[PDB]
């Protein structure tokens, strides 16, 4: 019910204050605080994002919510507590982790991502699916980024929320990320209402490229104008900012922004040049991709940009389309 949903949000917003105190003030939180600071998190940024620490006792969140009079079973349903399937006992889901609040589109805390700082597995532990936290709907940072997304008429999608935090701080405000999932149809529906322009900046490795191709193809199919920023090899935005600084980052992002078709064919370049079967198949694919582009202006430019990869004239490619 809406009443239960509200209680679950309250639980999240109240424990956040306790997590923040645990991280910033307590003895047990000291190592986690040092880890964040060495990773560039200022006290200001920690406070701004409301980042905290879940102690390792396994009953810190439990005892708090109990003391405040919350129903323990509801706290379990809210994804803050785990349940022993033997004695039906409850205990903290989040233990010895740095706690990053996950806010919904209206800016309410509806979940957490808990990162290890001692190399434990999994590296990041998220809230489970709950009535208020749904990964197919939530986009990290969307409530903060909405204003800039609208004014800049563009949304930038990154691979993870940590890259979002760093990018935002560096001056790139119109950024979001899913919580480790593939971009959903629901996400795309939300995004369309804000802008028709989406730029993908995933990590500069194979997995990143593959996800760029898969996500981009889907967005293109859905009628969005898709662009791609290609990071240096083995780098994510956080690593780029750490190495080159903020000004270098915001300049880089504004530099080589390529329409999806152009990015795609550049990836396939060698296979096309060497494998005639792939040449034919990818010429048909790229023709189809270009045909999906709603922007008459960008469509004509992509034809010009893609044609040389097949050693054909722009006119020949236009005819194939
Ligand atoms: N041990 C461990 N590592 C994890 C886990 N989740 C993600 N990683 C690794 O860390 C990178 C993704 O995490 P980030 O989002 O960069 O997190 P970070 O900044 O806090 O390190 C990856 O490098 P990558 O090799 O480039 O990933 P991929 O692109 O090759 O798949 C990925 O394999 C986990 O649960 N356990
Ligand atoms: Mn990666
Ligand atoms: Mn990283």
From Swiss-Prot:
Coiled coil: none annotated. One of its GO terms (cellular component) is cytoplasm. It catalyses: ssDNA + n NTP = ssDNA/pppN(pN)n-1 hybrid + (n-1) diphosphate. The keyword Zinc applies. Mg(2+) 1 binds at residues 159, 203. It is an enzyme of class 2 (transferase). Mg(2+) 2 binds at residues 203, 205. Transmembrane segments: none annotated. Residues 153-234 form the Toprim domain. GO terms for molecular function: ATP binding; DNA binding; DNA helicase activity; DNA-directed RNA polymerase activity; zinc ion binding. GO terms for biological process: DNA replication, synthesis of primer. Binds 1 zinc ion per monomer. Binds two Mg(2+) per subunit. Keywords: DNA replication, DNA-binding, DNA-directed RNA polymerase, Magnesium, Metal-binding, Nucleotidyltransferase, Primosome, Transcription, Transferase, Zinc, Zinc-finger. Its cofactor is Zn(2+); Mg(2+). The keyword Transit peptide does not apply. Its EC number is 2.7.7.101. Contains an N-terminal zinc-binding domain, a central core domain that contains the primase activity, and a C-terminal DnaB-binding domain. Monomer. Interacts with DnaB. RNA polymerase that catalyzes the synthesis of short RNA molecules used as primers for DNA polymerase during DNA replication. Belongs to the DnaG primase family. This is DNA primase. The lineage of its organism: Bacteria, Bacillati, Bacillota, Bacilli, Bacillales. The gene is dnaG. The chain holds residues 111 to 428 of 605 of the full protein.
């Amino acid at each position: 019910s809406n009443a239960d949903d509200l209680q679950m949000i309250e639980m999240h917003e109240l424990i956040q204050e306790f997590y923040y105190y645990a991280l910033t003030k307590t003895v047990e939180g000291e190592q986690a605080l040092t880890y964040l600071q060495e990773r560039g998190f200022t006290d200001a940024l920690i406070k701004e994002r409301g980042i905290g620490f879940a102690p390792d006792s396994s009953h810190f969140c439990h005892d708090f919510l109990q003391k405040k009079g919350y129903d323990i079973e509801l706290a379990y349903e809210a994804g803050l507590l785990s349940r022993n399937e033997e004695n039906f006992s409850y205990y903290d889901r989040f233990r010895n982790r740095i706690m990053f609040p996950l806010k919904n589109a209206q800016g309410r805390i509806v979940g957490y991502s808990g990162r290890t700082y001692t190399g434990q597995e999994p590296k990041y532990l998220n809230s489970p699916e709950t009535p208020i936290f749904q990964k197919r709907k939530l986009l990290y940072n969307l409530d903060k980024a909405r204003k800039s997304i609208r004014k800049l008429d563009e949304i930038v999608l990154l691979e993870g929320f940590m890259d979002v935090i760093k990018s935002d701080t560096a001056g790139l405000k119109n950024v979001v990320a899913t919580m480790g999932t593939q971009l959903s149809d629901e996400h795309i529906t939300f995004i369309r209402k804000l802008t028709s322009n989406i730029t993908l900046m995933f990590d500069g490795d194979f997995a990143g490229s593959e996800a760029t191709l898969k996500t981009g193809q889907h967005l293109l199919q859905q009628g969005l104008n898709v662009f791609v920023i290609q990071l240096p090899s083995g780098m994510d935005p956080d690593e780029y900012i750490g190495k080159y600084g903020n000004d270098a980052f915001t300049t880089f992002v504004k530099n080589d922004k390529k329409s999806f078709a152009h990015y795609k064919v550049s990836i396939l370049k060698d296979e096309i040049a060497h494998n005639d079967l792939s040449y034919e198949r990818y010429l048909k694919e790229l023709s189809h991709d270009i045909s999906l582009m709603k922007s008459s202006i960008l469509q004509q430019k992509a034809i010009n940009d893609v044609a040389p990869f097949f050693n054909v004239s722009p006119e020949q490619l236009a005819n194939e389309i």
